[PDB]
Structure 1
Amino acid sequence: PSQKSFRTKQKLAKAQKQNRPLPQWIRLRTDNKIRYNAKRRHWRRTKLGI
């Protein structure tokens, strides 16, 4: 809701931060294994559970 607590809004900001694709320069490093971010979250598919 619009009326939200500080603790909730703090949790929401972190969830936005982690919802980003892989930076491209990561894939160029020596012996790199990660090709995409496997922990993406979409607001309508999987809920945050807060």
Structure 2
Amino acid sequence: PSQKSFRTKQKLAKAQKQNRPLPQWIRLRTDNKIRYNAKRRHWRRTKLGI
């Protein structure tokens, strides 16, 4: 809701930060295994459970 606690909003800020695709320069590093960010989240599919 619009009315929200500081603790909740801080959790929501971190959730936005982790919802980004891989930086593509990572894939160029010597013996890199990560091809994509496997920990993405969409707001309508999987809920944050706060």
TM-score of the superposition, structure 1-length normalised? 1.00
Give the Cα separation in 1 of the matches to 2:16 and 2:32: 25
* Length, aligned pairs only: 50
Give the alignment's Cα RMSD to 1 decimal. 0.1
CA deviation after TM superposition for structure 1 residue 27, in Å: 0.1
How far apart, CA to CA, are the structure 1 residues paired with 2:3 and 2:14?
Answer: 19
State percent identity of aligned pairs: 100
Equivalence for 2:9: 9
For residue 19 of structure 1, report the CA deviation from its aligned partner: 0.1
* Structure 2 spans left out of the alignment, 5+ residues: none
- CA distance in structure 1 between the partners assigned to 2:37 and 2:20 by the alignment: 8
Q: Structure 1 unaligned runs (5+)?
A: none
1:31 aligns with 2:31: yes
Mapped to 2, the partners of 1:29 and 1:39 lie a distance apart of 20
